[PDB]
């Protein structure tokens, strides 16, 4: 917490965003997409996959006739992903970069306060103790102009940066509705292969 | 002598201005003809009089379009000090005419008007084409055509109630662009550390050779302020372009055809869209299809009998309580399970969930 | 195509005035020179306004001081006549001179005029040896040595209780460590070759606007308007073409400025008449040419003009005539109007055309089905890679010079954020040509005998 | 180990432009590629 | 006297701050109610405990 | 909605002043108070460095008139010290102080 | 990965001088030496070699 700098918390606390995630997970397994498109319904999951298999072309007999195989692969696949995220630190690269970029840019803004910008000194107090009001003034002007440009370039970078982040948020919002709340027919929108559920 | 610093700044704003003409053209200009609705309005019960242009109003804008125009709003007279607003290439009259062409095509020439010759068919016989595209058989409409029409008419007329209660996406752009430019004109009053903010007010005191420094302070001041506005607007224009590109795609698939994306042109299954002109934007009246009043049954993967499995052609086996029926996917239309609507496979000894049941053999009555 | 070049401009050709009679008040010289001025310790406040100004000094006589606090085109100033005249008078030792100035703060800056900044009016500290000096010492002037320092610029120090720097109170005595709160001038004409008495009377105008009081004689020639001229009215000179002032105003509101400091403040002291300043049409320009190959003919297009001339929303097209019929767009002019080189011969500007209009019949029963087909082939060009140049940063910015490595580092390592990304562009160039063509993983080859059931692939 | 890369160079003007840098000045393995003359890597 | 350069940065900067709240609101807030998983979790073999 | 209006930062309560001592212990004292003072013709000096100087005097003790030569903070010193010491030793006739 | 550090420079290796074969002489003399002048009115700008 440096001078003039502050950070505000997200709209939804992590303890609360987990509430939305819990509801969406709880609603998707007990009501398929029915809760997204109207009131939730009691369609049991084992046969709901037969609905999702039927939605890509494969008949619904493949599920029941091979339900045990499907369940084991689902459980095995879910178990394996945990290791992938924890096995390597590069899995959450995209989330890491946004935090690192913002912090690095924020540090540069504060670090710019040391630069003299052509003035005698980089402190407003000593100059007033060494420069006459005219001198101090006629020299402080060169100091503010340096900081405003340094600060302004920070605001512009956030605007440039925030625009690209808002692109992902829109895609995350749209991808979450189409993938989580329904089966996507788009060839490449829910991972390689014919989408089943997310 | 400062250089051609903004010999390119005009290029940036001029380039942005010219592009906007492309945005409004790629979106609405999706047809090489201007179709017109027939004078007789008989679409099997559907009432489009709330979205097609009304000849009574000289402006020739449909009531929904008229509502939007009144909804969205110094501000317009800036004394013309270095700034001006270029008029749009094609006026709202041209944009409205473009939109009416799309409505006159989707309503009559269905969608085949965007893929070559614009063949036309009766609307009740076109909604059956679109109903068939979401897993509901054609007959489901003609049995409920009167109910569907009375349900589409009321629903479309309820949009104004929502709007009349809105256009934040469009209003934000107008306000944000105006505010960003407003600060540019309001920052000329700043002194940038000089004696005064008026150029003509400080041009009769100091030596011109010794006056260059004082004026140069304002030269580097306002120039940076102008540059930031150009850079800021240049970035935002890209944001609108992405929305413009998104709008063009919707006007090419959701309206000029029936899409299959889950949630891309509305909440639920997609039937048809109706574009509507709006100030610096477009409003899509997606006409989706949502189920309700569902009921719970009992289902098995495939009916097995006499050591011979049987599977549904297109439908899910259900249970009325004591007999077994084969119904379509979305709507509930039970049928007598017959070999005509179900094929055979396997041996019934490998599947799980098979339920013994009897199907009907048509040959029996022919030999009695 | 269509190009753009230097636009159109107009120049005013009048600057008449009408108001002069700047009273007669002449207190400027009064402050400039009068009876012997007071000591540096005590100033004397004088304000000059609603006067003829008469900037016939400084350049006059000699000695004096510089200004460093003005605008452009100096001469006898005039034109802009400022707002106030803060006439300050006093007497200084005369050797300092630079002490009361923009910089060089020594010991005089303790409680004397600090000259914060601007200080419109400069200083006129000349040499006066005959006056302000007497053989019998001529103390008169009495200024303090030091009292707490930094006594603020506009804060006259007329008090007592000298600082008496020490660990004990002053006690109202002048003895051990108790100095006197005043320094005696004690200078006579004989002594002080460089410290002879000098007269300085500084002034402050705090310039705040061009049209104001305390002006200098002008020329009431007459009043002009409605021609987009820049006549010189009082301090201001206008910009553009005047218009009627329908806006309501009040007696205590004779200056107009909404957001851009427009010249709405022309209250016309001569004859109270608020004027509305507004520049006339700027104009545009663009050359519509069919190319230097076909013919050396063109048709200029402007941006905003109220005009063989076609009135277009984008401007006026000169040299091209509009035709009632419409053709296919060739040169995009904008606003739905395109010009082209179509039949003597000339340049034609017309209204763009969408396409041929055709319809298809139908009733409750009809449909169209093709009977024959036709295979077609069409190209689709697509850029993949671009020849990537490798431009360095130093040489270009700075070649081989001794000061090249010292002044370059004053900014930092900005070349790090300059040449780092250029290589990335280069690498991505080949990654574009690797994923495009190297799709298949095995390199095949067609059979030696070309027999594909009739198709010919020799091309 | 590292492989220095230069943008505008050939296999002759690199050496001309403490003792460590002399190692890459001459170079026992020099590759002239599009991006430049990367030093220290062997093409295969 | 430097002008409104100060405010423009503050107001513009706050826009991104409010924007973030709008980003999360349109991602997770896709249901008008709250759903709880059933106590018994027999899903025909599938394990969602992860 | 919410609008970020202004800021309310906590101001410093006070300011603490003191010196870290450092190169100190000036022998400057053994200059004025001494014995066997030299004559006027004889010249003497005593360089002082690597110490704290500690001028004081003037406003301390009694007598010891000033010399009317100061820059910033007259009769305060501290800020201006000058890296040099010149301990001259001579006696005037006693009636030519201004001389 | 690949990172960028600096940009190697190349410095000169020689310098020379070259002037014509002309030479004169007026060290504050031919050009600056008394030269009784006329009144202010007859201040014609005389030409010097
Ligand atoms: C959780 O999912 C896994 C999927 O196989 C299963 O849990 C396994 O249960 C067996 C039986 O005791 C254990 O030997 C394994 O160690 C468990 N984990 C794994 C990864 O195999 C089970 O189907 C599900 N239920 C529970 C309670 O674990
Ligand atoms: C200095 C003095 O004694 N008298 C001056 C005179 O020299 C000067 O010419 C005149 C014009 O301002 O003002 C008075
Ligand atoms: C052009 C002209 O006349 N200017 C002024 C005007 O105010 C008036 O004529 C007179 C005042 O009585 O003084 C003079
Ligand atoms: C069939 O033709 C008649 C002819 O008058 C017309 O009234 C009717 O609307 C047509 N039906 C359809 C579905 O277009
Ligand atoms: C099943 O169909 C028969 C048809 O005769 C009907 O009588 C019966 O009510 C249906 N099942 C239930 C649970 O109602
Ligand atoms: C279905 O018919 C087969 C035929 O033998 C029989 O073995 C089986 O038990 C029947 N199913 C049930 C649930 O009784
Ligand atoms: C010039 O002639 C025509 C002009 O339309 C042009 O198409 C052609 O390419 C040009 N040829 C040469 C040789 O300049
Ligand atoms: C252009 O000039 C004509 C000439 O009278 C005038 O009537 C018209 O109003 C002008 N244009 C505009 C936009 O006012
Ligand atoms: C174009 O049409 C208008 C409409 O009457 C007519 O007045 C004009 O003469 C036509 N153009 C020419 C060149 O005749
Ligand atoms: C090919 O097209 C022609 C008309 O272009 C048609 O007459 C002919 O019948 C078509 N081919 C066949 C095999 O019919
Ligand atoms: C690069 O420099 C070498 C140095 O001799 C030279 O032979 C060669 O022609 C230059 N160009 C290329 C492409 O290698
Ligand atoms: C000499 O005597 C004075 C008088 O009190 C006192 O400061 C001290 O004893 C001697 N001076 C110094 C500097 O020690
Ligand atoms: C002209 O130049 C030559 C050298 O090129 C030199 O020897 C000669 O003296 C010059 N002429 C003069 C100085 O009159």
Curated annotation (Swiss-Prot), chain B:
Region (Heptad repeat 1): 145-192
S-S pairs: 254-265, 304-348
Mutation effect (residue 204 to A): In strain: Alpha/B.1.1.7
Positions in coiled-coil regions: 171-215
Known outcome of mutating residue 176 to H: In strain: Omicron/BA.1, Omicron/BA.2, Omicron/BA.2.12.1, Omicron/BA.2.75, Omicron/BA.4, Omicron/BA.5, Omicron/BQ.1.1, Omicron/XBB.1.5, Omicron/EG.5.1
Outcome (variant: residue 172 to N): In strain: Delta/B.1.617.2, Mu/B.1.621
Substitution effect: residue 113 to L: In strain: Eta/B.1.525
Glycosylation sites: 47, 296, 320, 356
Site positions per UniProt: Cleavage: 61-62
Effect of mutating residue 42 to Y: In strain: 19B/501Y, Omicron/BA.1, Omicron/BA.2, Omicron/BA.2.12.1, Omicron/BA.2.75, Omicron/BA.4, Omicron/BA.5, Omicron/BQ.1.1, Omicron/XBB.1.5, Omicron/EG.5.1
Protein name: Spike protein S2
Gene (UniProt): S
UniProtKB/Swiss-Prot annotation, chain D:
UniProt-reported outcome of changing residue 41 to V: In strain: 19B/501Y
Name of protein: Spike protein S1
Glycosylation sites: 10
Disulphides: 11-37
Included stretch of the parent chain: 607 to 656 of 1273
Species for this entry: Severe acute respiratory syndrome coronavirus 2 (2019-nCoV)
Variant or mutagenesis effect after changing residue 7 to H: In strain: A23.1
Subunit structure: Binds to host ACE2. RBD also interacts with the N-linked glycan on 'Asn-90' of ACE2. Cleavage of S generates a polybasic C-terminal sequence on S1 that binds to host Neuropilin-1 (NRP1) and Neuropilin-2 (NRP2) receptors. Interacts with host integrin alpha-5/beta-1 (ITGA5:ITGB1) and with ACE2 in complex with integrin alpha-5/beta-1 (ITGA5:ITGB1). May interact via cytoplasmic c-terminus with M protein. May interact (via N-terminus) with host bilirubin and biliverdin, thereby preventing antibody binding to the SARS-CoV-2 spike NTD via an allosteric mechanism.
Positions of region (Disordered): 15-28
Described function: Attaches the virion to the cell membrane by interacting with host receptor, initiating the infection. The major receptor is host ACE2. When S2/S2' has been cleaved, binding to the receptor triggers direct fusion at the cell membrane. When S2/S2' has not been cleaved, binding to the receptor results in internalization of the virus by endocytosis using host TFRC and GRM2 and leading to fusion of the virion membrane with the host endosomal membrane. Alternatively, may use NRP1/NRP2 and integrin as entry receptors.
From Swiss-Prot, chain G:
Consequence of changing residue 29 to H: In strain: Omicron/BA.2.75, Omicron/XBB.1.5, Omicron/EG.5.1
UniProt effect for mutating residue 36 to T: In strain: Omicron/BQ.1.1, Omicron/XBB.1.5, Omicron/EG.5.1
Glycosylation sites: 13, 15, 21, 33
Effect of residue 36 to K: In strain: Mu/B.1.621
Region (Disordered): 9-25
Quaternary structure note: Binds to host ACE2. RBD also interacts with the N-linked glycan on 'Asn-90' of ACE2. Cleavage of S generates a polybasic C-terminal sequence on S1 that binds to host Neuropilin-1 (NRP1) and Neuropilin-2 (NRP2) receptors. Interacts with host integrin alpha-5/beta-1 (ITGA5:ITGB1) and with ACE2 in complex with integrin alpha-5/beta-1 (ITGA5:ITGB1). May interact via cytoplasmic c-terminus with M protein. May interact (via N-terminus) with host bilirubin and biliverdin, thereby preventing antibody binding to the SARS-CoV-2 spike NTD via an allosteric mechanism.
Role: Attaches the virion to the cell membrane by interacting with host receptor, initiating the infection. The major receptor is host ACE2. When S2/S2' has been cleaved, binding to the receptor triggers direct fusion at the cell membrane. When S2/S2' has not been cleaved, binding to the receptor results in internalization of the virus by endocytosis using host TFRC and GRM2 and leading to fusion of the virion membrane with the host endosomal membrane. Alternatively, may use NRP1/NRP2 and integrin as entry receptors.
Protein name: Spike protein S1
Organism listed in the record: Severe acute respiratory syndrome coronavirus 2 (2019-nCoV)
Lineage: Viruses, Riboviria, Orthornavirae, Pisuviricota, Pisoniviricetes
Gene: S
Covered residues, full protein: 311 to 359 of 1273
